[PDB]
Curated annotation (Swiss-Prot), chain A:
Binding site for ATP: 116, 159, 188-191, 196, 223, 263, 275
Binding locations of Mg(2+) 2: 275, 277
Cellular component, GO, one term: cytosol
Identification of the protein by name: Biotin carboxylase
Naturally occurring in which organism (per UniProt): Escherichia coli (strain K12)
GO MF annotation terms: acetyl-CoA carboxylase activity; ATP binding; biotin carboxylase activity; metal ion binding; protein homodimerization activity
Length: 433, 424
C-alpha cells in the first residue's frame, strides 16, 4: 500500500480524506495556504507544507507549488479531492510526468469527458442514453422534419421569447422562424420537468467497474445542489440495473479508473445523460450510508493498483440517506459570509453523521467557497431519515455567522419534499427565484 | 404512539431518549434537579420540571415528586432510563397504580429478578445455564460431585484434584461450587412484548472492566459462533416468556470454554446498548416505546441480522492515574466525526460537570465491516476528541485500543486490572 500522500485540497473533503488515510496506515501531507493554517486537517496531518498565499490562484491552483511539495516530503501520490484541479488534465498529466500517482482517472480520459461532444459521442457508442434529437442539421422537407419530431416526441425545441413546440401545427413556423433569426438549425427533445439522478461508479483500470445505486440531487438553487439523497425515490431495481450496467460498460470502454459519476436527467421513466464528473463528489456520503462502502478508501486501493474488492452482487442497497449541505452565506446574495464562529455544537445520535472541519473559535475566511459542512442522517426508510434530519438540524448550533440552516429546516419541513419526487425547479420556485 | 412522556433520568441517557421521542412525535417532559438545569436535553425538551435540590436522594430518587410531574403535565408514560429508579419495584408499582405507564417490565418481574435466589430458581425453570455446584463430612460422595462439577472447584479455597480435597475442605469447615478461573463477560440482548413474543439481539462482550465496572464494550463477541449464538439466544428468549417479560432487557453470563453461566438480568436498557443498534440496525429505544404503547413486536427473529462489528469506549471524568472523579468546567470541546463514528453525550463547551452524580459524560461508538476497521476508527476518533478543563479517561482508552492483546480479542475480566497493576 501507499506510503504517503498529498492532500491537494482543503476544508471538509481534506479532512474526509485524512481520516481515510489514517485508517489505511497512509502518511499524510497537508498542503495549505497561509490562510488555512488553522484548518482542522492541517492540524491533524503528519506533515505540513504552506504552498502559497491566501488566494486560490496563488495556492490551491498552483501546480508547481503543489508538485514540489510532493518532491520534498517524498510523497508517492496526490489526491485532488473535488473542485480544484480534480478535473484539470494538465495537473493530472503533470503529476504523472513528475513521478507521482494521480488519485483519479487518466488525463486522456479527463480530456475526453471534458468536452460535451466527445463525451456524448463516447456515450452514444457505449449505449448511454442521451437526449434525443436530429443527428445532423434540420432541412427543408416538412414531411421528414415532422417525422423526426414524432420519433423524439413533443415537446421539443429547435436550437426573443424562447420557444417550445408542442405539436405539428407549430413545427414548420418555429423552424423557419429560427432560420430567419440568423439573417442552419437543429431540433432537440424538450425536458420540461425532469429530476436530477446521478449514478455512482468505481473502476479499477484493469477491466472491473461497479455501480453503486443512485442519488437524487433535484433540490438545487442556481444550478447548485442543496439537498441530496439516496436511493432515488421512484427508482426500481430493474430501472437501477438497466442504467447501472450501461454505466459500468461505458466505464470499461473508456479505460476509466477511480471513482466517477454520471449525471442524468430523469423524466417519465427515462434517462438522459448530462455529464460525467471525473472525480469523487461532495455528495458521496449519502451513498456510503446505503451500501456501506467507503468510497474514499476504495479510491485509495485502486490507486495502489489493487483491483476491485467488491463484486456487483455484494453491493446492496439498505435504508435511505439524506444530506443537507451547510453553508455560511448571504441569504440574499448567497455569497459566503465569512467570520469567526463564537459557538459551535454538532449534532449526534443513531444514524447521524457530521462531516465538517469547523470548530468553536474557528474563523471562516472569505477567499474560498461558502460550504462549511454536511449533515447526513440515515434511516431504515426515507421518513426516518427525514425525521432524524429534522432533529439533527435543531440540535446544530453555529454562532457568529449567517448560515443556511433555516432554509434546510424549511425544506425538511416541505410538504412536497416529504412527499418526494420534486423536480429541478421546485426549489427556486418556492423561494421566489 | 404515546403522547407525552417523562424522562425519569438525566445526562447522556436522557438525551438519547429525548431524540428517540422527537422522531416518533412524542412530547417530552424533563424532570431535573436544580443542579442539572443546564443539561442539554433539558434545554431541548418540550416541557420542564424542577423536582428538587441536587442530591439525587432528594431529586432523581424523589418518587412522589417524579410522579407529581407526570400529573401536572398530563403525561402518559415514564421512562426510567438506567441506573436510578429503573430497577425499583416500588417505583414501577406506584407508577402504574397512579395510572401511568411504566416503560419497563412488570414490578412483579422486577422483584422476581432482583433476588439472587429467586432468579436462579426461575432460570433453572426456564432451563438457563447456571453455575454448577453442590446443590446443598463425607469424603466419599463429596468427591463424586466434584467429578460431576469438573475441576477446578471451590469450597465456599480452590481444588484441582481429589488430593487437596480433605485439607481444603477441613480448612473450609474450620458449599462446593464450580470454579471459573478465566471467564469472559458475555451478555445477551432481548426484547419482549408481554404479548407472548420474544426476540434476542445477539450478544456483547464487556470483559474489559475496572472495579467490576465496564470500560469498553463490543459487539458481536469474538469467538462466538452462530450455533452458540442461537443456543443461548433461543434459551434467553424462551425464558422471557416463562417469566412474562415485557420490554428490553439483558441476560449477563460468564463465558468460559464454550460454556455460559448465568450471572444476572438487568431488567432494563443498558448503557452499552448502542453497540447493538449498529450491528443489527435496531433502535433499541424506539422499540421500548413501542412496546409501551401496546404494539406488538415489530421484528421477527429471522429478520435479525448481524452485520459488521462495533466498539464502545466509555468516556468518564476521572483522574486516569488515580480514578478519582473529576468534576469541573469544560472549557474546550471538540467531538469526533466521520463514517461509522457515533458520539453520544450531553456535554458541551462551557458546560459544568457536577460532583453530585456519576462520572460518565459520554460514549464513543465506532463501526466497521470488521473488528479491525472499528478499532482503527476508534483510534482516530479518540485522536480527534477534545475535552479540556477536566481530567478524562481518554488516554487510557487510547492505550486500550493500542493493546496488542485487545487487538487480538478474547480477553478476560481480569486483563485490565492486571494491565494496570490493580490486582495487588
Amino acid at each position: 500500500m501507499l506510503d504517503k500522500i498529498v492532500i491537494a485540497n482543503r476544508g471538509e473533503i481534506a479532512l474526509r480524506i485524512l481520516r481515510a488515510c489514517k485508517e489505511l496506515g497512509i502518511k499524510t501531507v497537508a498542503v495549505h495556504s497561509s490562510a488555512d493554517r488553522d484548518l482542522k486537517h492541517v492540524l491533524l496531518a503528519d506533515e505540513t507544507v504552506c504552498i502559497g498565499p491566501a488566494p486560490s490562484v496563488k495556492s490551491y491552483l498552483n501546480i508547481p507549488a503543489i508538485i514540489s511539495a510532493a518532491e520534498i516530503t517524498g510523497a508517492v501520490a496526490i489526491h485532488p479531492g473535488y473542485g480544484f484541479l480534480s478535473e484539470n488534465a494538465n495537473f493530472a498529466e503533470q503529476v504523472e510526468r513528475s513521478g507521482f500517482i494521480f488519485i483519479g482517472p487518466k488525463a486522456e480520459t479527463i480530456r475526453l469527458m471534458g468536452d460535451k461532444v466527445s463525451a456524448i459521442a463516447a456515450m452514444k457508442k457505449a449505449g448511454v442514453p442521451c437526449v434525443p434529437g436530429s443527428d445532423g442539421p434540420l432541412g427543408d422537407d416538412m414531411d421528414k422534419n415532422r417525422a423526426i419530431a414524432k420519433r423524439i416526441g413533443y415537446p421539443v425545441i429547435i436550437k426573443r421569447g424562447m420557444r417550445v413546440v408542442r405539436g405539428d401545427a407549430e413545427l414548420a413556423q418555429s423552424i423557419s422562424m429560427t432560420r430567419a433569426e440568423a439573417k442552419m438549425v437543429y431540433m432537440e427533445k424538450y425536458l420540461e420537468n425532469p429530476r436530477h439522478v446521478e449514478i455512482q461508479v468505481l473502476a479499477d483500470g484493469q477491466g472491473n467497474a461497479i455501480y453503486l445505486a443512485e442519488r437524487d440531487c433535484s433540490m438545487q438553487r442556481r444550478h447548485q445542489k442543496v439537498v441530496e439523497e439516496a436511493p432515488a425515490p421512484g427508482i426500481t431495481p430493474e430501472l437501477r440495473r438497466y442504467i447501472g450496467e450501461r454505466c459500468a460498460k461505458a466505464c470499461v470502454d473508456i479505460g476509466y479508473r477511480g471513482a466517477g459519476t454520471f449525471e442524468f436527467l430523469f423524466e417519465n421513466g427515462e434517462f438522459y445523460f448530462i455529464e460525467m464528473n471525473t472525480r469523487i463528489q461532495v455528495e458521496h456520503p449519502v451513498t456510503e450510508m446505503i451500501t456501506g462502502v467507503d468510497l474514499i478508501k476504495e479510491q485509495l486501493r485502486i490507486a495502489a493498483g489493487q483491483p476491485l474488492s467488491i463484486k456487483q452482487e455484494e453491493v446492496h442497497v439498505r435504508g435511505h440517506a439524506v444530506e443537507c449541505r451547510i453553508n455560511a452565506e448571504d441569504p440574499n446574495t448567497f455569497l459566503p459570509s465569512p467570520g469567526k464562529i463564537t459557538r459551535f455544537h454538532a449534532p449526534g445520535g443513531f444514524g447521524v453523521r457530521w462531516e465538517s472541519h469547523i470548530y468553536a473559535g474557528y474563523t471562516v475566511p472569505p477567499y474560498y467557497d461558502s460550504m462549511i459542512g454536511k449533515l447526513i442522517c440515515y434511516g431504515e426508510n426515507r421518513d426516518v431519515a427525514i425525521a432524524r434530519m429534522k432533529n439533527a438540524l435543531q440540535e446544530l448550533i453555529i454562532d457568529g455567522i449567517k448560515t443556511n440552516v433555516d432554509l434546510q429546516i424549511r425544506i425538511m419541513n416541505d410538504e412536497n419534499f416529504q412527499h418526494g419526487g420534486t423536480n429541478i425547479h421546485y426549489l427556486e420556485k418556492k423561494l421566489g427565484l
